[PDB]
Amino acid sequence: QICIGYHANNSTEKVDTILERNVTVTHAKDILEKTHNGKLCRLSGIPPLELGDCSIAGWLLGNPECDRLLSVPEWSYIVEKENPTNGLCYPGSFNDYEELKHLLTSVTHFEKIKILPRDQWTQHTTTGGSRACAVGNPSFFRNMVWLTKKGSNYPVAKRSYNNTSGEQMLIIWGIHYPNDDTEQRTLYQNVGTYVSVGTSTLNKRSIPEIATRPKVNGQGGRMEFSWTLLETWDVINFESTGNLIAPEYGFKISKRGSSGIMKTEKTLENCETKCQTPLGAINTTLPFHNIHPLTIGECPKYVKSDRLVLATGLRNVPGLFGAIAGFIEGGWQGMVDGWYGYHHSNDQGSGYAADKESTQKAFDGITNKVNSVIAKMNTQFEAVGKEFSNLERRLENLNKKMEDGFLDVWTYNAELLVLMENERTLDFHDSNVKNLYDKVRMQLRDNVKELGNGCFEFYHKCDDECMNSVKNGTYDYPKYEEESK
């Protein structure tokens, strides 16, 4: 007796296919990454700029509450709170704020130079402060200078600066909007003041917009700050008859490319990632994850799925070709050195023997299928998270419409890819067993009867050495011409 069978085990591993659901399989592979390390790490050897609970505005201006900030010269992404607590301690806005944040998202190299020393403002008062930026005496943004009148005079304030630092330089200035005409006169003496700033390409003139406002942080006044990148060997001109908040420092900056701000509560924790999420770092080979949409780095695609499992083994039986769970009704728990093999009732022993060469062709194939699915996915560095003012609601909605559009597409493709390929994997094994059976039938023919359960009854004495002529595809028909039929 010779029998063609297939492998079985104690697996409870389930998969879905196009045609059937919850189908138990021999071996399987999850291709969806769902675990992180819950840490917040450094991105490819380069740390994040950690802001604690300051805002970029607050950090750059020199809010006294950002003094203990600790600044690296490099950083690869920024960490901020979804709602920071130390920003403009003096009320105001920041022109093109989001553009500025996006510009500082990632940096070479970035250092703070002193470009316009306080004391050189010789005809003006410099110590101007406010209870709003208080340390319990009134202080002010440490990087800026509030030029006010000296005595009863405010002469034209006018300085320039040639960018000799060798690198593109970020420079910030501001204009102060008083609460009323009287407060204007006591700070600046003059009424029709203006702030004028100009470079080669920049060319801007502001005038104070005096108006009655509710108090924010106990102040009815406001400051509107602006910023420019001063190109190398170019000069920036300030001229003002009042209301200027002058920079004292500039920031040398260089960039390789762009990145993201990560909105989170966590804190850098000393490690390494190629891919960071607000919940933790991801180290994975798999092509999909479902951890968090807002990642930074080279990440697996984010999918709205919570199971993506490829069958690799075979239908676990305690098809399209009619073999597995077909004319060969069940699998063999015994044979464990292959996926398909032989079982023989003889006069010596009996008798499980794996078909190495056919199990090998299949380990190769299925290994290739898995690797096709995984290795064909392209993962370049991206930043996902994005920033919009509350007058860019449409733009923000456009961005969400896009992220969501790709999310729907990848999920659908993934789900269906897994389902379709699982149906073909099973048929694959089913075909392999069926061709095994046939690779024996077309060879025995008359020296055996077709029993049914994938068995052949021998018309002669087939000792262990004859049973090996069948297993290795080299059985001779001529030799056994004994007709017991």
Next chain:
Amino acid sequence: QICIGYHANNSTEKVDTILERNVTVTHAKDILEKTHNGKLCRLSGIPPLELGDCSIAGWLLGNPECDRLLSVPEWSYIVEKENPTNGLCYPGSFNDYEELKHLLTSVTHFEKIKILPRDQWTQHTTTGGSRACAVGNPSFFRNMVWLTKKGSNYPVAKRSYNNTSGEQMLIIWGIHYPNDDTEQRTLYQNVGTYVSVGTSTLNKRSIPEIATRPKVNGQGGRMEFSWTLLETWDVINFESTGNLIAPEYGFKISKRGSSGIMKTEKTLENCETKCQTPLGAINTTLPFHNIHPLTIGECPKYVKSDRLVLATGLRNVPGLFGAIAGFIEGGWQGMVDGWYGYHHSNDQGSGYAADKESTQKAFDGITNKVNSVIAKMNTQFEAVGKEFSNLERRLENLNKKMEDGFLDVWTYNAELLVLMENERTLDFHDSNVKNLYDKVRMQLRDNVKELGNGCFEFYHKCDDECMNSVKNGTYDYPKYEEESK
């Protein structure tokens, strides 16, 4: 004698496959929804704000032509004509208009409130009107007040409002731009006038731009409107020496999400949908539709295709496994209670009996195939259509480039899905038939003769309970040892 066969009927359904075109099939399912109810319906219980032929601006300002408007307090989307006939009856612009429309696109909750009563502008005149907003007497936007001179004086107009309504409040104001220096004085006496508006975050000061302009609605002047959201318990301050168009009303407003403006002339009708289009509402389980690109709601994916028919039954004849339309050269008109079955020529009679074991595995399977294709589609709520000013041409083009890009992707994938899955459905049936035939052959053997056209000729007698033993898989070889050969 027992024949193996498969179902055929009078159907004329055609599907396409990867390898074949116009292939007549037994049963099919169109997975492309292309019918609407020609009605404009309310969305998950909540109706649309119907603007008739007014613009949002005309509505909010109180254009007199928008009096019999009817205003719901809720609304889930807005209906507006492509080009409304009642907007600014007095010529002018509206700062950040598109952002405002996007804000009002859906709403909790929306209530107009008198916040600055006219008659309390005690030192100014209120009955300012124009022929441009005629009723046939000069009139004006009903929600605004045109402050002008009282005698030969226009003092500092200065009022404020604390938002005690417990909701976030929309507030609009405008400044006037006269056609020439003389028109100005007859209206405001003063010449260096300004308009000042402040809140906690708002801070604005506008000055009039006197200049000769072509007459729109017989008017050379222009009115430039602005708007802000005043937060709860915050106060807004107005101050002006002339040219201020003050609001009388504010609008309490709350929001959960965003929605969209649907261009169309149809009117609300009193039905319901999860999904609306400018042509009619859609009610469907199907994953795709081709009615119209600009839907609002939880919709199927829009595709360029105009036919996605999924084969569910089998090839219909008067394959890959070479049974169907192959070695069994035809289907059976007769048999109608299964897809595959038997036909016995016996001394009692004949002979059609469907096969319930395999026909059920197929219903099961093809059912799951359809459900997988449908139930994997992710359908959240979206609004598609958007709005852009004539200086956001690039941004609009970005949006189109985006909507067009997904359209191409979903079309291609749906078209190919159907083509591939159809080829594999037919091969599924072809296989089920081939396996039936094989399950019978492997049960008889010696006891019967393989004819060629799918039949077995018995080498012995076989009454009815002889067939009912083969069909159910319970046939015992040993009992029949007559070898008429």
Next chain:
Amino acid sequence: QICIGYHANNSTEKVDTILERNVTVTHAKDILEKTHNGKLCRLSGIPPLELGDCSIAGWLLGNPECDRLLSVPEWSYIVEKENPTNGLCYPGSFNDYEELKHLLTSVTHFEKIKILPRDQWTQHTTTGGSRACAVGNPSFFRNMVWLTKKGSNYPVAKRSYNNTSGEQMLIIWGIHYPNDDTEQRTLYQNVGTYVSVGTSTLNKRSIPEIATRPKVNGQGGRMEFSWTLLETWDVINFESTGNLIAPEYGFKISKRGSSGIMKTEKTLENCETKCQTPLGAINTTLPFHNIHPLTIGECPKYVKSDRLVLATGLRNVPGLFGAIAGFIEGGWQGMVDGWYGYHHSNDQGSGYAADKESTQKAFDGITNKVNSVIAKMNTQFEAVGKEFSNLERRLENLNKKMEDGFLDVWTYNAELLVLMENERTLDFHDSNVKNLYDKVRMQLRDNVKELGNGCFEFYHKCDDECMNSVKNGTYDYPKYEEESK
């Protein structure tokens, strides 16, 4: 004897399937276009507007270095260098420049009309020039008029123009920002000047800002230009007390759709395409290419792949159904008129004969498969390249994140489509052979013996007439009852 077999040849064409790599195939089709003509062509009959090394700004204003420019009236895209040498010869900015470039991207119809002739500026000096626009006396943009004082006076400059031209007209004006108070007097005499421009919808008043600036092209002053579309039968009104840079010309423009600007150094070169890239033109039926991402026209999808070969022939051997390179161990070099066929050994001769019928079914099926993959692709017209100022980094990053999104999607889908469909083409051929073999075995039966690699040994005499019957499917069992067994 009669044997079934398949085609083989001397191909070294290789394809990848889901299960195998580097598989040598009988015939194949590359579906990735990889070649361009290196020419810069015209798009569907319509040329590009070529700018040499001017910028659109310099071209419209009429920079004297653009005299040789060659202006056509139609054009389907614009060719510009990455960084053009002749732009604003006199330093300045250009309000909403990117929107203007986008406007002019494609054009009907485009024609320069003389709308405000120089000489009619009778109260002012017109020949105002600058050394910055030297010809080697001072000159100026040829399409603009630099109004300066005549004698010691500069009367209110006031002119209007009503667009009677039958098309929408683009108009450009400018305001001069001088370097210092004396430059202003020597040019304009007056002190608190203004520039007023108005139409139906446009309404701008501009006062000049005198300030000290770095010198660019030797100028401290700056000129800011603005533009508008003057609709038909509308009028534009200029009024100015100095500092106006007036138009002399407007541009009748008409637009069907939109296009793009192509950045490259190449020149128009007198040929044709439906699809243009900065490297050269593409003439192709294929659905995919990898030449360059920035195309213009009706183009194949761009993918990161650099090999998309579709198998069309069978495994080459000099599978899933166990025929090809399976139970029939190899192919026939010498069957050159079909994919599958017969080899008869006869008393007469022997004996390769291609099977016309089934080879055709295959040529048909694979033709369809290739046409389905190619023809389902949606090649609408798009421009791709896009322009953003340096304060639109976010917006530009938004666009990049989108182009990449689609690139990643199309690439993955194409790669896997090929792999999956290759796996099934091979298995298709395999199936055809297996079935042709069975179509003989079921037709002979007793009358022949199953030998080995697809061979049947006849139990009777078979002449070249009997042979033909087996081949054409007519052979009869009854006739030949010679039972040499």
